[PDB]
Amino acid sequence: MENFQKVEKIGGVVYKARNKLTGEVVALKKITAIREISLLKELNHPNIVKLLDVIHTLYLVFEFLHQDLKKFMDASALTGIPLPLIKSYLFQLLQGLAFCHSHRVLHRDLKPQNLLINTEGAIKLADFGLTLWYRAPEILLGCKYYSTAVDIWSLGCIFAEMVTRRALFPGDSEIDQLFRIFRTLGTPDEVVWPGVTSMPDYKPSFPKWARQDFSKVVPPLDEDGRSLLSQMLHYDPNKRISAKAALAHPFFQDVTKPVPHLRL
Numbered sequence: 001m002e003n004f005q006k007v008e009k010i011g012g013v014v015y016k017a018r019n020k021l022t023g024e025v026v027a028l029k030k031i032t033a034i035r036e037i038s039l040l041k042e043l044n045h046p047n048i049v050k051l052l053d054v055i056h057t058l059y060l061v062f063e064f065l066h067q068d069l070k071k072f073m074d075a076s077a078l079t080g081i082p083l084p085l086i087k088s089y090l091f092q093l094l095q096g097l098a099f100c101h102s103h104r105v106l107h108r109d110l111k112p113q114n115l116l117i118n119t120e121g122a123i124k125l126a127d128f129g130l131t132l133w134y135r136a137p138e139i140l141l142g143c144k145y146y147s148t149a150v151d152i153w154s155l156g157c158i159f160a161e162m163v164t165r166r167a168l169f170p171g172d173s174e175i176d177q178l179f180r181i182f183r184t185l186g187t188p189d190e191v192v193w194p195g196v197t198s199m200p201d202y203k204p205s206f207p208k209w210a211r212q213d214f215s216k217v218v219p220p221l222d223e224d225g226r227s228l229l230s231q232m233l234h235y236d237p238n239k240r241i242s243a244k245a246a247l248a249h250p251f252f253q254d255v256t257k258p259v260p261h262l263r264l
């Protein structure tokens with residue numbers, strides 16, 4: 001760590017830093033684990049933040065990117081992110097997740113704060129392999145052996161927030177999170193989700209709300225985009241669309257790679 005000069009606090013704790021002798025600016029994270037971290041160094045992809053070095057002496061040295069998606073959404077709040085720029089970001093994240101998922105690795109806590117962007121129009125996943133708003137309902141209902149579907153759920157909540165400029169399900173506790181999901185998509189039962197009533201934290205006493213129309217939940221989104229969102233938010237994890245199959249959805253027929261307007 002004598003080889004690094006802390007520039008500033010970025011957001012254990014994460015620091016922007018300069019390799020005192022090398023030229024690189026980098027993002028430095030101060031934290032069976034050692035072996036797990038060694039499997040991540042080899043998990044390299046254009047939509048995954050690069051893990052440069054693992055220093056057990058345990059610090060993690062990542063590639064640096066200049067902005068997170070949460071701050072970018074706040075700066076675009078007045079006018080909103082142009083739809084072609086929303087569509088490009090979703091397409092790329094789906095590529096990232098498809099990659100992770102084919103090597104059996106989950107993210108588990110996806111959110112706007114850990115999604116990083118550059119001037120080139122690229123978007124990357126961070127915290128891979130290491131707020132309740134983006135949490136999948138199987139996690140809330142006590143399933144202990146949850147699947148890659150938990151990430152697809154989280155990415156759909158994020159898709160929706162970009163389009164509407166509001167958080168889809170902004171809960172401040174586990175039961176609040178759950179009841180907001182229920183009020184929008186209807187309380188789940190054995191019809192839509194087989195096995196649901198025999199989950200560790202399921203209660204037969206849950207209120208029974210009815211489902212709302214998707215044209216109400218994300219109005220300005222066109223029909224292809226609303227179709228894909230409803231398959232990313234299916235209650236049953238085995239019905240939820242996989243990353244690979246979402247990439248072939250007709251929503252991405254006309255996809256491009258626009259450049260964003262970033263003020264750094």
Ligand SMILES: CC(=O)Nc1nccc(-c2c(C)nc3ccccn23)n1
Nearest residue numbers: 011027062063064065066067068126
């Ligand atoms: C502006 C910015 O956050 N850049 C950046 N580059 C690379 C990595 C990270 C990073 C990593 C590795 N973990 C977290 C957690 C929260 C926010 C950013 N990060 N952050």
